[PDB]
Amino acid sequence: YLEAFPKELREYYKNLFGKEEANKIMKKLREPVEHYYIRVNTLKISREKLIGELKKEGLKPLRSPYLPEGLYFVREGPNFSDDFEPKLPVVVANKYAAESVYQGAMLYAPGVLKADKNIKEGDEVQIRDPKGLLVGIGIARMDYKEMTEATRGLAVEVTLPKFKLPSLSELKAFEKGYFYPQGLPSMVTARVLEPKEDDVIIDMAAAPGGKTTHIAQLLENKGEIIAIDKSKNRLRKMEENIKRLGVKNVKLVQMDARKLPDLGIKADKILLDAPCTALGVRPKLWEERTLKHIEATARYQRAFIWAAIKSLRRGGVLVYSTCTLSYEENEGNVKFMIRKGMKLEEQSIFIGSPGIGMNKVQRFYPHKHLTQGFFIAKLRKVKD
Ligand SMILES: C[S@@+](CC[C@H](N)C(=O)[O-])C[C@H]1O[C@@H](n2cnc3c(N)ncnc32)[C@H](O)[C@@H]1O
């Protein structure tokens, strides 16, 4: 599994976590989350009612004893060994199709990069990513010719994916806005912010609106939430999410959030779920980002942070989060905040790990918490 991670990043991990933990982290990072979480949209339905609805569809949701809006599904797999060499014609899926097949998705024609020419419908085939990673096995529903030419349709029915997570996007319950798939650490993030109906609230990197809409249901659609993003496409997806979830709480504004103080607002609560190297996301088939990205991104996040701090009222609260493991983007950027008049505060929910040489921040690790790698800091603005 170590091959998925560039050599200098591997050394970085070993240095930062210690060899043993680093090897455990990278090994687990290559796999999908063991517990696949979704958020109950309490704006439209209760947890237990939704459970009832999901059991109807043959799903086995489990309740979180920490998040009353939390449900999770247990992952299946691995369904074959890491060294398994099936005696099968190969279908090569592109980078994106391979990752979904890796988690139980079917393989559709546009997801096909190239294939063995002997493949005819009904043949048992193996599916590999462009770098030879075996991600799944299944039965071809197209001949080679149609497989490499079709623009739509089912190409391989994946009957033996490496791992299996439930597909929820096609459920009636999903279309009706009953839930929003979202990791446990992300749900913790919105809770730890503790939004009030009174608060002036800003989500300055909000799209597609996962944490924003969570705040909305915690507010029970009261108050107002200002949600900022630079990407129009992602904001467009956020608009759809808001409508589907029945969110009436949120004001969308498109802009570079680094210029946030250009508005005249001093917020009581700011969520900064910052763009990051995403070193913690799962599954991690091949990590492309490395050390140069950590430094560059860490510096890029500082602009957001400083923008937030200036836009906070004294006594105001900032919640900073990333889905990355690096020190520089996490504990290091919090030291920055401490030098800028912010103070660390106890988070209302702490089920992850302590930070690196740092006490009140919260880290999540895949091998310890069965989640994506994650980081959460909660700060109080004591002065300007
Ligand atoms: C980690 S994602 C945020 C996800 C969000 N917190 C959620 O729960 O769904 C980072 C987002 O920040 C946005 N972004 C990146 N640079 C930005 C900038 N300079 N100004 C405003 N938004 C930016 C990206 O469009 C991206 O959608």
Question: What residue segments make up the domains of the chain, in order of their start?
Answer: 1-78+165-384, 79-164
Query: What's the distance, CA 199 to chain centroid?
Result: 26
Atom of ligand 1 nearest to the CA of 209: 9
Q: Which of 367, 283, 281 is nearest to 103 (CA)?
A: 283
Question: Is 323 a residue of the active site?
Answer: yes
Distances in Å between the Cα of 72 and the Cα atoms of 141, 180, 266, 354 are 32, 11, 37, 24
Task: Take residue 359 and report the two structure tokens written for it.
Answer: 């006490």
Rounded Cα distance between 372 and 194, Å, is 22
Q: What angle do CA 111, 170, 125 make, to 5 degrees?
A: 35
Q: How far apart are alpha carbons 179 and 202 in whole angstroms? A: 23
Query: Would you say 209 is a known binding-site residue?
Result: yes
Cα 126 to Cα 10: distance, rounded to the nearest angstrom: 30
Resolution in A: 2.5
- What is the rounded end-to-end Cα distance, in angstroms, of the chain? 47
Amino acid in position 202? I
The Å distance, Cα 150 to ligand 1 centre, comes to: 34
> H helices then E strands: how many in the chain?
12, 19
In this structure, how many other beta carbons lie within 10 angstroms of the beta carbon of residue 332? Answer: 16
Ligand 1 centroid–CA 44 distance in Å is: 26
Q: Pick from 139, 111, 113, 127: which is nearest to 163 by CA? A: 127
Rounded-to-integer distance, Cα 257 and Cα 303, Å: 9
**The sheet that has 134-140: what strands, in order across it?**
107-108, 154-161, 134-140, 124-128, 90-93, 112-115
Catalytic position from the list 51, 192, 219, 323: 323
- Cα 366 to Cα 56: distance, rounded to the nearest angstrom: 31
Question: Ligand 1: which of 182, 230, 279, 318 to mutate, judged by most atoms within 8 Å of the beta carbon?
Answer: 230
At residue 57, the 3 state secondary structure works out as coil
Atom of ligand 1 at shortest range from CA of 208: 9
129 Cβ below 6 A of ligand 1: no
Q: What ranges make up the beta strands (E) of the chain?
A: 35-40, 62-63, 70-74, 90-93, 107-108, 112-115, 124-128, 134-140, 154-161, 179-181, 201-203, 225-229, 250-254, 267-273, 312-322, 342-344, 353-355, 358-364, 374-381
Cα 59 to chain centroid distance, Å, stands at 22
Question: What is the rounded distance in angstroms from the CA atom of residue 258 to the CA atom of residue 305?
Answer: 8
27: enclosing H helix or E strand: helix 19-29
Other Cβ atoms closer than 10 A to 309: 21
Q: How far is CA 100 from CA 105, 161, 320, in A?
A: 5, 9, 29
What are all long-range contacts of 239-245, with beta carbons under 8 Å and residues at least 24 apart? 241/180, 241/208, 241/209, 241/213, 242/209, 242/213, 244/175, 244/177, 245/41, 245/43, 245/44, 245/177, 245/180, 245/213, 245/216, 245/217
Query: Alpha-carbon distance 270 to 195, whole Å?
Result: 9
The experimental technique behind this entry is: X-ray
Q: State whether the beta carbon of 329 lies less than 6 angstroms from ligand 1.
A: no
Collapsing DSSP to helix, strand or coil, 103 comes out as coil
Pick the atom of ligand 1 nearest to 323's CA: 1
Q: Which residue has its alpha carbon closest to ligand 1 atom 10?
A: 275
Q: Which of 12, 21, 31 is nearest to 289 (CA)?
A: 12
Considering the segment(s) 79-164 as one domain, its CATH architecture is Roll (2.30)
Q: Which two tokens stand for residue 231?
A: 């990407």
Q: Reduced to 3 states, what is the DSSP secondary structure of residue 20?
A: helix
Tokens of 182: 């979202």
Question: Cα separation of 199 and 250, whole Å?
Answer: 13
Question: What does each C-alpha distance from 177 to 45, 233, 272 come to in angstroms?
Answer: 9, 21, 25
Structure token digits, residue 318: 């900032």
Measuring from atom 5 of ligand 1, which residue has the nearest CA? 206
Reference 327, options 286, 279, 283, 379; nearest CA is: 279
Contact call for residues 320 and 337 (beta carbons, < 8 A): yes
Q: What is the four-CA torsion angle of 291, 295, 296, 300, rounded to 10 degrees?
A: 140
Ligand 1 proximity of 317 Cβ (cutoff 6 Å): no
